[PDB]
């Protein structure tokens, strides 16, 4: 291509904001670029967005005396000539620290092949189907997120309860250790004085303490098993959301691409808004 109008250029996008540019320049290779109208919205700016070092670098093109250029002097007839020149030659002429080639253009013609059945009612019905499928997918993802947050609170409360149970076991085992400490060398006094009623009641007290600590062991073990089961369910819900998420993102991309194609095809927005 020797020279072509910028409206027919693949890299030129026209009237869009920085946000969709960042979405289309997101995690792409070095040198990926597009040309859009500047946000100041006056004729003749035609700013360029390039990706270098993982950053969305943004360059301004001036429109003095009917020409174009990155800086003074302006030695380009059209923006397409400048784009081709910096597409064949590195941009280091303007700035030596920007050692990057304009490798890949963000072509709006690339996403045209995604949509099929170009007639208006077919794309309307297809947009309706993907939009409602996105609706059940999103409501499933939010219900799963709600369940995940609730189960996470249950994990936190159950873990706090287990930690309290372990500290209770430490308390009661310290009590049993003190009982043994004050009883090991002192039951000989019981043997000399020879009363069996006090022996049987202190053994009853030790037995009921043993029953209490065994019951607390049983409760701690049961709640630990419940925590393991509920954490397994937590893992399953997390896995389910991680499975849903790429599908939801793909449905979002499909809906956005269909809406953009309908907007650029001259389709009425209000005629498609109320179908949902």
């Amino acid at each position: 291509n020797n020279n072509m109008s910028l409206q027919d250029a693949e890299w030129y996008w026209g009237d869009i904001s920085r946000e969709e540019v960042n979405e289309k320049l997101r995690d792409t290779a070095d040198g990926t670029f597009l040309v859009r109208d500047a946000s100041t919205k006056m004729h003749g700016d035609y700013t360029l967005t390039l990706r270098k070092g993982g950053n969305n670098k943004l360059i301004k093109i001036f429109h003095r005396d009917g020409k174009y250029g990155f800086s003074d002097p302006l030695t380009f007839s059209s923006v397409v000539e400048l784009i081709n020149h910096y597409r064949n030659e590195s941009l280091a002429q303007y700035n030596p620290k920007l050692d990057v080639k304009l490798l890949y253009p963000v072509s709006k013609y690339q996403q045209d092949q995604v949509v099929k059945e170009d007639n208006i009612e077919a794309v309307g019905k297809k947009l309706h189907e993907y939009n409602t499928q996105f609706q059940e997918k999103s409501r499933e993802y939010d219900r799963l997120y709600e369940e995940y947050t609730r189960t996470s609170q249950e994990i936190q409360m159950k873990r706090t309860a287990i930690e309290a149970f372990n500290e209770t076991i430490k308390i009661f085992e310290e009590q049993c250790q003190t009982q043994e400490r004050y009883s090991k060398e002192y039951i000989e006094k019981f043997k000399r004085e020879g009363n069996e009623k006090e022996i049987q009641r202190i053994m009853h007290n030790y037995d009921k303490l043993k029953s209490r600590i065994s019951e607390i062991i049983d409760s701690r073990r049961r709640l630990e098993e419940d925590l393991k089961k509920q954490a397994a369910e937590y893992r399953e819900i997390d896995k389910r959301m991680n499975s849903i998420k790429p599908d939801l993102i793909q449905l979002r991309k499909t809906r956005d691409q269909y809406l953009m194609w309908l907007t650029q095809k001259g389709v009425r927005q209000k005629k498609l808004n109320e179908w949902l």
């Binding site: 500290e167 308390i171 389910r240």
Partner: protein, 977 residues
């Protein structure tokens, strides 16, 4: 989850199984509201029944120990507190010897209760940075305490009751004309008498009146520096010598035309009422490195493996780890990805190299990384989804580069985060061990690598190193908003003209965006410019504290500007954003936390909201530890106010529990049985004692008193918010308000409402300053926790839906305003309604809040119009507040015609002036919405959202074009207007 594990309210008969030091076990039937000392009393009474009573010692030498519901062995030197408030996990109490200082442990219990998590795990956590912060923040705590005790008892009164003023000593022209020759009719209410008898005097004094001379002519009219002015109905005092009209109460009385009423109290009475803050010094305070720049190597990090990743095997084939070295939000080099290993065995053993050098690493460099999963076998497009994320500070708090192994526990993906990496997220490992963990390995350079100090940086400066004609480009870059379309041409122009940028102080945020932080010489030069930079305004200074400027010296310059310009009132206005940008700090110990704590410990009004803003996000585990440590520091050094805060917490948690037993147990039956259960639960004495006589969290000056049980109800909304009505213990406070109504709303997040009302208050302030009396009604809203908070209720106001229902139409609202206040004050009500409508229309269009219906917009009896239940602000273009004909009739004074209405033309003029004022001050609004990203609202995550308020304010278009933009928006609202 209440007073026992699994039991909300314990039965009146409680079988405690206490634990004896001798070795015996008791089974004691304990009284319901019993205190611990009598529990020990008939513990030792029945101790004689069981053997080994001879080994037992006196009652007073022994202390109860038990495990609470927060998993810690609490020991109880506080015998005066009842068992209901003890929060037992199981009913047992071990009796042992003293093991520590009593006052320290009682203070620790109060601090842990106020925070909501124990100080014991702050002691037991082995992070050196946490312990070093806990030790070093006590220095500024002690300095703030000493400054608070510098001019005792006057400075203590300043701390407890700070002056509620605003910044400007002077008055706007549109309210100076509101007074008869600049005179304020003020009523001073002296209760000083042999009996408790009120009596009054009326004074016609000036607007620049010091309260000392106010009481001077008060005594002169009575028919001497020992009296103070206290505002009727609340704990607001006029202490420091300031103009009278500068106080917020007097200013609000000038705003609304209400009669200012004040006490005349003795200085000695307040000085004896205030106690001495016993700042006990905590116990834990007792407890060959080569430079960064001399390393000739590239930065590489080794990914070992992941212990487990929560991903399905038959839906996802491969997973990888995407990394990247970031400086805030912008990468210092290209992101590097690990090899796409199968998801069954996340085992990597892979070195990752980066396009950056070891000396080129900036001080605030962070390794942001995320395990991610691939997809796309069906179709030619392949997508990567975020799966788990984590950030590591490449330099720790000791200025040392990380090295060796590091087990980083990753965080769950934020809701609605498309981005593979999350550089805006917090740093550090996840405390939850049930999270995916990744083993990182940073390269070992045979020594400890330390970032160079200021000396080496300054020596590197001045080594790599007439006014120009076109200096207007610098001003043009300065005047644009922080999220402007800044080019590499403007960046190179800024960096090539950095020496001449010092003559425009407010261009520093742009210049810091021009410098590339992956270059050592540029970083050193920009540091040299920062060191000698002139101070900037606080509104511009807080911009340098968001996620876009993570550099410690940039944030230090911003904190110094906050020290040297920012006032207490603007700090209170901007306390939400300054608290939220504490998460953006990479280290617990920084200058911003010291500034916020020092200002919070010298101002109870500032410190109260500081405590509550930190407390409202303790549920967020991303910032739980840092805010918990800060809350520990504040609660140690605040003094007596902690007890008051404890009372507040009690009430709040009680209300939370009540709302719990209102919203997941009995949400199905009719409302009347719910009201019966409400009055039964709230009539019980301990709920009363928790809900009686505590300071209002919405306003610490408003001291809530007796609770009227007859009119505490539930509205018919979706989440069933709880209406509370409180009395005032003082008997003559009928002048300001006889009642305190508060909506306790749980389930709906109120951080959105807090941000919206703060922004609305700021628009009100800008409009009042410019010359427009465009009064808003930013009612008090304070979130207290996870989707739970408080809302101040506007007295004598009804929703438009209630007005329409009670009148029965289009003319019913104007008819109601005609009927409520007719006569010569009808014109004032009409002008008030029109003007408040214009201001709220402009604010709602600019903020773009959720769809407005008649249920969520209210009008007062005097005609003031205001908005409630914001919720969904910005985007979650669409004008929500379309001016309906119900308002067209009232603005046009009931005229059928609306297009050719002169009052409608004045409405247009006020709206246009408001839009131009907010467009002129939009830099502050963009700054405040950018500082709020780390909170995590569902509709505020990245700058893509702030582009909405960028577009509605028409900051991209010229100043003139915004006029026609507002024209077109209002004409589309009216279908021609």
């Amino acid at each position: 989850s209440g007073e026992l594990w699994g039991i909300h309210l314990m039965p009146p008969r409680i079988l405690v199984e206490c634990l004896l030091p001798n070795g015996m076990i008791v089974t004691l039937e304990c009284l319901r509201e019993a205190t611990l000392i009598t529990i020990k009393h008939e513990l030792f009474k029945e101790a004689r029944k069981y053997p080994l009573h001879q080994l037992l010692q006196d009652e007073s030498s022994y202390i109860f120990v038990s495990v609470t519901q927060e998993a810690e062995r609490e020991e109880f030197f506080d015998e005066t507190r009842r068992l209901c408030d003890l929060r037992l996990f199981q009913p047992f109490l071990k009796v042992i010897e003293p093991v520590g200082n009593r006052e320290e442990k009682i203070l620790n219990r109060e601090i842990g209760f106020a925070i909501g998590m124990p100080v014991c795990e702050f002691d037991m956590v082995k992070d050196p940075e946490v312990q070093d912060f806990r030790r070093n923040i006590l220095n500024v705590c002690k300095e703030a305490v000493d400054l608070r005790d510098l001019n005792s008892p006057h400075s203590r009164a300043m701390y407890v009751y700070p002056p509620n003023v605003e910044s400007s000593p002077e008055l706007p022209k549109h309210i100076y004309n509101k007074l008869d020759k600049g005179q304020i009719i003020v009523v001073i209410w002296v209760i000083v008498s042999p009996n408790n008898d009120k009596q009054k005097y009326t004074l016609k004094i000036n607007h620049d009146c010091v309260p000392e001379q106010v009481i001077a002519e008060a005594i002169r009219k009575k028919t001497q520096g020992k009296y103070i002015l206290k505002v009727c109905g609340c704990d607001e005092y006029f202490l420091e010598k300031y103009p009278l009209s500068q106080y917020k109460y007097i200013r609000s009385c000038i705003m609304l035309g209400r009669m200012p009423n004040l006490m005349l109290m003795a200085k000695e009475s307040l000085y004896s009422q205030l106690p001495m803050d016993c700042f006990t010094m905590p116990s834990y305070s007792r407890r060959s490195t080569k430079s960064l720049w001399v390393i000739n190597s590239a930065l590489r990090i080794k990914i070992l493996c992941a212990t487990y990743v929560n991903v399905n095997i038959r839906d996802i084939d491969k997973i990888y780890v995407r990394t990247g070295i970031y400086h805030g939000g912008e990468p210092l080099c290209d992101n590097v990805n690990t090899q796409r290993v199968p998801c069954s065995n996340p085992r990597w053993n892979e070195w990752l190299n980066y396009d950056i050098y070891i000396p080129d690493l900036p001080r605030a460099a962070r390794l942001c990384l995320s395990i991610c999963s691939v997809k796309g076998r069906k179709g030619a497009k392949e997508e990567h989804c975020p799966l788990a994320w984590g950030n590591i500070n490449l330099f720790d708090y000791t200025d040392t580069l990380v090295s060796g192994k590091m087990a980083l526990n990753l965080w769950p993906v934020p809701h609605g985060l498309e981005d593979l990496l999350n550089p805006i997220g917090v740093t550090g490992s996840n405390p939850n061990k049930e999270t995916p963990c990744l083993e990182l390995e940073f390269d070992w350079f045979s020594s400890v690598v330390k970032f160079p100090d200021m000396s080496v940086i300054e020596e590197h400066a001045n080594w790599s190193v007439l006014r120009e004609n076109d200096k207007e480009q610098l001003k043009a870059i300065s005047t644009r908003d922080p999220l402007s379309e800044i080019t590499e041409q403007e960046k190179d122009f800024l960096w090539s003209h950095r020496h001449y940028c010092v003559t425009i102080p407010e261009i520093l945020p742009k210049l810091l965006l021009s410098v590339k932080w992956n270059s050592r010489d540029e970083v050193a030069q920009m540091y040299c410019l920062v060191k000698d930079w002139p101070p900037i305004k606080p509104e511009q200074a807080m911009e340098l504290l968001d996620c876009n400027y993570p550099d410690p010296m940039v944030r230090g310059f911003a904190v110094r500007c906050l020290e040297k310009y920012l006032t207490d009132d603007k700090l209170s206005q901007y306390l939400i954003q300054l608290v939220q940008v504490l998460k953006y700090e990479q280290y617990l110990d920084n200058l911003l936390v010291r500034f916020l704590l020092k200002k919070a410990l010298t101002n109870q009004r500032i410190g109260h909201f500081f405590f509550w803003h930190l407390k409202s996000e303790m549920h967020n585990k991303t910032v739980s530890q840092r805010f918990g440590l800060l809350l520990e520091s504040y609660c140690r050094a605040c003094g007596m106010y902690l007890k008051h805060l404890n009372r507040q917490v009690e009430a709040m948690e009680k209300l939370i529990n009540l709302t719990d037993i209102l919203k997941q147990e009995k949400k199905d039956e009719t409302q009347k049985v719910q009201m019966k259960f409400l009055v039964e639960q709230m009539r019980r004495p301990d709920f009363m004692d928790a809900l009686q006589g505590f300071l209002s969290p919405l306003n610490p000056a408003h001291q809530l008193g007796n609770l009227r049980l007859e009119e505490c109800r539930i509205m018919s909304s979706a989440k069933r918010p709880l209406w509370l009505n409180w009395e005032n213990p003082d008997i003559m406070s009928e002048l300001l308000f006889q009642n305190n109504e508060i909506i306790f709303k749980n389930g709906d997040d109120l951080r959105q409402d807090m941000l919206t009302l703060q922004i609305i208050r700021i628009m009100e302030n800008i409009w009042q300053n410019q010359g427009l009396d465009l009064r808003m009604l930013p009612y008090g809203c304070l979130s207290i926790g996870d989707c739970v908070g408080l809302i101040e209720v506007v007295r004598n106001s009804h929703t438009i839906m209630q007005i329409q229902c009670k009148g029965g139409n289009s003319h019913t609202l104007h008819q109601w305003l005609k009927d409520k206040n007719k006569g010569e004050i009808y014109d004032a009500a009409i002008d008030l309604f029109t003007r408040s409508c214009a201001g709220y229309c402009v604010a709602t269009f600019i903020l773009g809040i959720g769809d407005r219906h008649n249920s969520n917009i209210m009008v007062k009896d005097d005609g003031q119009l205001f908005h409630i239940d914001f919720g969904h602000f910005l985007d979650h273009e669409r004008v929500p507040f379309v001016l309906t004909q119900d308002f067209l009739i009232v603005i046009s004074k009931g005229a059928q015609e609306c297009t050719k209405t002169r009052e409608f033309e004045r409405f247009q003029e006020m709206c246009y002036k408001a839009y131009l004022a907010i467009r002129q001050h939009a830099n502050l609004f963009i700054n405040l919405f950018s500082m709020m990203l780390g909170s995590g609202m569902p509709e505020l995550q990245s700058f893509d959202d702030i582009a909405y308020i960028r577009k509605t304010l028409a900051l991209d278009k010229t100043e003139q074009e915004a006029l026609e933009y507002f024209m077109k928006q209002m004409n589309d609202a009216h279908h021609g207007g």
